[PDB]
C-alpha cells in the first residue's frame with residue numbers, strides 16, 4: 122500500500138482508517 | 154551492559170547528567186564490560202572525549218570487523234575516570250541510504266520519522282547504527298556472553314524494535330525519564346493532573362504531533378523485557394497512558410562530592426556568593442543604594458519552559474514579595490536570577506559596560522591603595538603614626554572625583570544581560586515588564602535574566618552552574634509538570650534550600666522519605682490540590698518566611714538541607730538499576 126507510505130511521508134495520517142496502533146499491537150506479539 | 158542514549162557527548166540538561174553521575178558507580182561495581190553508545194555532533198564533543206580510532210582491546214574485533222565498511226565508530230573515555238568506555242557514533246557520516254532504512258522500518262514495525270523534524274531522523278539513524286554495532290559485536294564475540302542492552306528516552310527507542318525484529322539474544326531494558334506526550338499536553342493550557350484516564354492518546358497525538366514518537370515509545374515499552382520510569386508519579390502516567398506498568402521504580406541519583414570537612418560547602422557558598430556579589434556590583438553600578446549584606450540570591454534554572462518549569466508563578470511571587478518588603482519598611486533586598494536559555498545575538502552594551510566600570514573603579518581604588526600603602530610604609534619606617542591627612546594629595550582626590558562622576562548613571566540597570574532577538578515575544582521579559590519590575594531604587598527585588606547556560610569561561614559571570622548554585626541562597630523551582638527534577642536535587646546535595654512541588658518527582662520522593670518536610674529546607678509547594686492563585690500565595694509566603702530568618706537560621710537551614718544528600722546518593726539509589734538488570738537477566742536467560 123504505497124498510498125499509505127506517501128500519505129504518512131507527507132506527515133498527515135488518519136486515525137479511524139487503516140493507520141492505527143491496533144496493527145502495531147497485533148504485529149508486535151510475533152516478535153516475542 | 155549497553156547504556157545507549159542520545160545525550161552522552163552533547164550537553165543537555167536531561168540524560169547527560171544522570172548518565173555522567175551513574176557511570177562511576179556502574180563501572181566500579183561491574184568493571185570493563187560497561188559500554189556507552191551515543192551520537193556525534195560537530196559542536197565540540199570531541200574536546201571532552203578522548204577518541205581511540207586505533208584498535209584497542211576489550212571489544213577490539215569490531216574496529217577491524219566493521220569500521221572500515223562505510224561506517225564511523227570511535228572509542229572514548231570522557232575524561233571522567235569511571236571507566237566509561239564509550240562507543241561514539243557519527244550521524245552525518247552514514248546518511249546516504251536513509252531510504253533503505255525507512256523501508257526496513259516499514260517492513261519491521263510500520264514506523265519511522267517524517268521529514269519535518271531532523272532531530273528524530275538523526276535519532277533513528279543513530280539507532281540503526283547502534284543496532285548494527287551491537288549485532289556485529291555479537292557476531293564477532295561468538296555470543297559467549299549475554300550482554301544487557303539498556304535504552305533511555307525515545308531518542309534511542311528504535312533500538313528496541315530493531316533488535317526485536319532480528320531476535321538478538323539480549324536482555325532489553327527501557328527507561329523513559331519523561332513521557333513527552335505529557336509534557337506537550339501540560340503546555341497546551343489544559344489540566345493534566347485532575348484526570349489521566351479520560352485522555353484519548355491517538356486523538357491528541359498528531360495535532361500537536363508526537364504520533365510516530367508515541368507509537369515507537371509504546372512499541373518499545375511493550376517489546377522491552379524490562380520497563381522502568383524515574384519516579385513513582387512517572388509510573389502513574391506510564392501505566393495509565395502507555396498501558397505498560399514499569400517493573401520497578403528507579404529514582405535518579407547524583408554523585409555527591411564528599412569533602413574531608415562537613416562545613417566545606419559553606420566555604421564554597423561564601424566564595425561563590427562573593428563572586429555573585431562582584432557581578433551584582435558590576436551590574437548595579439551607580440545604583441548601589443541597598444546593603445549587600447541584606448541581599449539574598451534566588452534563582453530558577455533549567456530549560457526555557459515557562460508554564461512547565463514554573464516561571465510565571467515565581468515572578469508573581471517575586472512581585473508580591475517586593476510589595477510586602479516595600480510596605481514593611483525592610484532593609485532586605487532579593488536578587489532573583491533566571492537561567493533559562495533563549496537565543497540571543499550577544500550581550501547588551503549596558504551589562505558589559507557595567508562590569509567594565511566596576512573593575513575600573515576597582516583599578517582606581519587599587520591605585521590609591523598602593524599610593525597610600527607606600528606613604529604608610531614610609532611613615533612606619535620613620536617611626537611616626539600617620540595623621541591620615543598628609544598622605545592623600547589633590548591629584549588622587551581629583552581622579553577619585555572623576556571616577557565617581559564617570560560612574561554616575563541615570564537609566565535603570567537592565568533585566569536581561571544578553572541582547573535577545575525577540576523581546577516583544579519573550580514570556581519572561583513580557584511578564585517582568587507587566588508586573589512592573591525594572592530594578593528601580595524603590596524596588597526591593599531585582600530581577601536578572603541570564604538567557605544562557607552558565608560557563609566558567611564567560612566574559613561576565615565566570616562561574617559554572619554548580620559554583621553559581623552554591624553561591625545562591627534559595628533555589629525556587631515551582632515546576633508544574635516535570636518527571637523528577639535535577640536542579641533541586643543538586644541544590645539540596647550542595648546544601649542550598651530549595652522550593653519543590655508535590656507534582657515533582659523530587660518533591661514526591663522527599664515527601665514520604667522525611668517526616669515533616671520544610672524543616673530541612675525542602676519547601677514542598679502544593680500545586681495539585683490548590684489553584685494557581687493559591688499556589689502563588691503559598692510561594693509568596695514561603696519566600697517571605699525565608700526572608701525573615703537571620704543569618705544563623707540560614708546557616709542552620711543550609712546544614713539541615715545538606716544533611717539530606719545521602720538520600721539522593723547513587724550508592725543508595727543505584728540498587729534499583731541492579732534489580733532491573735537482575736530481572737532482565739532472569740527474563741531473557743538465567
Ligand SMILES: O=c1ccn([C@@H]2O[C@H](COP(=O)(O)OP(=O)(O)O)[C@@H](O)[C@H]2O)c(=O)[nH]1
Nearest residue numbers: 166167170454455456606607618638639640
Ligand atoms: O545553567 C544551567 C542550568 C541547568 N543546567 C543543568 O540542567 C539540568 C536541569 O535538569 P532538570 O531535570 O531540572 O530539567 P530539564 O532541564 O532536564 O528539563 C541540571 O542537571 C543542571 O545541571 C546547567 O548545566 N546549567
Ligand SMILES: O=P(O)(O)OC[C@@H]1O[C@@H](O)[C@H](O)[C@H](O)[C@H]1O
Nearest residue numbers: 419420422423426626704707708
Ligand atoms: O549568605 P548568608 O546566608 O548570609 O551566609 C553567610 C555565610 O554562610 C557561609 O558561606 C559561611 O558560614 C560564611 O562564613 C557566612 O558568612
Ligand SMILES: OC[C@H]1O[C@H](O)[C@H](O)[C@@H](O)[C@@H]1O
Nearest residue numbers: 167330331383635636637638
Ligand atoms: O526525569 C529525569 C529528568 O530528565 C528528563 O529528561 C526531563 O528533561 C527532566 O524534567 C527530568 O526531571
